[PDB]
Enzyme design. Sequence first.
Site, PDB file in Angstrom:
ATOM      1  N   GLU A  59       0.796  -1.207   0.000  1.00  0.00           N
ATOM      2  CA  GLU A  59       0.000   0.000   0.000  1.00  0.00           C
ATOM      3  C   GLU A  59       0.832   1.261   0.000  1.00  0.00           C
ATOM      4  OE1 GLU A  59      -3.150  -0.159  -0.767  1.00  0.00           O
ATOM      5  OE2 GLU A  59      -3.008  -2.335  -0.758  1.00  0.00           O
ATOM      6  N   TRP A 115       1.506   1.816  -3.439  1.00  0.00           N
ATOM      7  CA  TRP A 115       0.478   2.527  -4.205  1.00  0.00           C
ATOM      8  C   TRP A 115       0.653   4.061  -4.130  1.00  0.00           C
ATOM      9  CZ3 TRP A 115      -3.602   1.673  -7.578  1.00  0.00           C
ATOM     10  CH2 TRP A 115      -3.828   0.302  -7.919  1.00  0.00           C
ATOM     11  N   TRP A 174     -20.530  13.443 -18.873  1.00  0.00           N
ATOM     12  CA  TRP A 174     -20.850  13.829 -17.501  1.00  0.00           C
ATOM     13  C   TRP A 174     -21.941  14.893 -17.474  1.00  0.00           C
ATOM     14  CZ3 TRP A 174     -18.972   9.882 -15.557  1.00  0.00           C
ATOM     15  CH2 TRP A 174     -17.709   9.395 -15.924  1.00  0.00           C
ATOM     16  N   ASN A 229      -9.917   4.045   3.109  1.00  0.00           N
ATOM     17  CA  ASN A 229      -9.850   3.703   1.690  1.00  0.00           C
ATOM     18  C   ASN A 229     -11.194   3.164   1.157  1.00  0.00           C
ATOM     19  OD1 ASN A 229      -8.425   1.303  -0.471  1.00  0.00           O
ATOM     20  ND2 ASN A 229      -8.142   3.509  -0.656  1.00  0.00           N
ATOM     21  N   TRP A 256     -15.792  14.650 -12.749  1.00  0.00           N
ATOM     22  CA  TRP A 256     -14.798  14.202 -11.792  1.00  0.00           C
ATOM     23  C   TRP A 256     -13.852  15.283 -11.243  1.00  0.00           C
ATOM     24  CZ3 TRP A 256      -9.530  14.135 -12.730  1.00  0.00           C
ATOM     25  CH2 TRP A 256      -9.165  14.407 -14.059  1.00  0.00           C
ATOM     26  N   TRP A 314      -9.155   8.792  -7.465  1.00  0.00           N
ATOM     27  CA  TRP A 314     -10.373   9.184  -8.205  1.00  0.00           C
ATOM     28  C   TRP A 314     -10.434   8.505  -9.568  1.00  0.00           C
ATOM     29  CZ3 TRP A 314     -14.987  11.661  -7.508  1.00  0.00           C
ATOM     30  CH2 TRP A 314     -15.197  12.072  -6.190  1.00  0.00           C
TER      31      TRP A 314
END
Length: 419
Positions: free
Chosen positions: A243, A246, A274, A309, A327, A350
Amino acid sequence: GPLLVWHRGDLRLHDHPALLEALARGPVVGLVVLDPNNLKTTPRRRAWFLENVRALREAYRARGGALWVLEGLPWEKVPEAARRLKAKAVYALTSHTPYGRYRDGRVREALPVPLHLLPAPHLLPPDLPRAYRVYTPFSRLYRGAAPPLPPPEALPKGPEEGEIPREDPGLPLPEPGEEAALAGLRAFLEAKLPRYAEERDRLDGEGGSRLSPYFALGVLSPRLAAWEAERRGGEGARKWVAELLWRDFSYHLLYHFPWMAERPLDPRFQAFPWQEDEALFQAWYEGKTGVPLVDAAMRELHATGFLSNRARMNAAQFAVKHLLLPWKRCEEAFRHLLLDGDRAVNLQGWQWAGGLGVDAAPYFRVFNPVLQGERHDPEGRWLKRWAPEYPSYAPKDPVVDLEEARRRYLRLARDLARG
Ligand SMILES: Cc1cc2nc3c(=O)[nH]c(=O)nc-3n(C[C@H](O)[C@H](O)[C@H](O)COP(=O)(O)OP(=O)(O)OC[C@H]3O[C@@H](n4cnc5c(N)ncnc54)[C@H](O)[C@@H]3O)c2cc1C
Ligand SMILES: Cc1cc2nc3c(=O)[nH]c(=O)nc-3n(C[C@H](O)[C@H](O)[C@H](O)COP(=O)(O)O)c2cc1C
Ligand SMILES: [Cl-]
């Protein structure tokens, strides 16, 4: 003349290449510049940064040393401090971000003495030649943490200058400073690491370290953390270090794919229709969707500046997939609410949760917000803390029809992603 050690997103004395590089050459004075490019943000985040600068000063003072804190543009204030101290050179950790590169180029121009930039400690650096879009092939380059550098024992005397403003966070901050960070790391590795693989997907985030707000400001080195976890070892150990990786993958991604701050990584989604909609945006943003999980998540976020998370991926995907909200707006609004808010990491998360091309996560995975709560909040305790409005994860009067929303997204998506 002294060497200046210029701390930016690295408010710590442990594992700090620039600080030791300078100390090995002569007496040092540290400097933080409170830069409006970073500080013109929400009170919670300004305060979190300021209070960590305050803790770093306390750490310098406790060791007999001097940390200056000046306010303004770095290319004015770094040269100012160098002149006032008669510094021989300035040391700092390299920044690979567009602003970091811009600012540091401008500082180098204005400084009449060298600026020496050293590699920041990472598990994997962001600027490797090869560009991975997928986490697995990137992760295989990592072969275990190098050892962290020690902190100095005591620091040379110097003059101190500058004030650290006191600002109102609007909410309770974690304990600031590396002493609190390292304590938290040591406790997590002892208590929680063993079951981390089994407990990291809780909606309440209580299987995790809760160290992100420290990572985001460099108050805790990721190299030190990976190194300590690997010395502890066990099953949770590999998985927790995955992690941390990440985080590095997120820096890698924004580095190789800078344009992803503008548009999906997946060019197939760059024309996704969108639907801007103020009323809808506000309902999401304020946790008033009538969807228990989403509303609990967004209400904890406003109140606390943190979210697990598993809560984040559900709140974020919901906006993108169920609500079809643009977004960029959501992304930015969401970062501003987080103590650990970190532009590259938030963008990664995201674009991953929204199915926009990170790690090639597939469009067709859509969180069912009631199953997600049942599966990641077993006795409803987390729901009851954050929106006890709702007696279960069943949507009460959702701002959209949820099954239609699901059907509409998948239709739209399975239709750009093919052809
Ligand atoms: C939509 C979305 C937005 C996010 N925005 C941010 C952000 O602005 N800043 C931020 O720090 N994290 C962000 N995260 C990543 C992650 O959720 C948080 O780092 C995590 O919840 C922190 O909790 P922890 O400290 O208990 O993590 P742990 O589970 O204990 O993990 C240890 C450390 O690894 C890193 N890490 C853990 N998970 C991730 C991940 N998914 N991606 C990148 N690094 C990870 C963090 O540095 C974390 O502190 C985001 C995730 C999503 C899905
Ligand atoms: C909320 C927040 C506030 C920050 N404030 C400063 C600051 O005023 N001075 C600074 O040198 N670094 C600051 N940082 C760390 C920086 O972001 C760091 O300068 C980094 O090397 C480059 O900035 P960037 O993240 O915009 O690219 C801040 C970070 C965050 C998350
Ligand atoms: Cl150099």
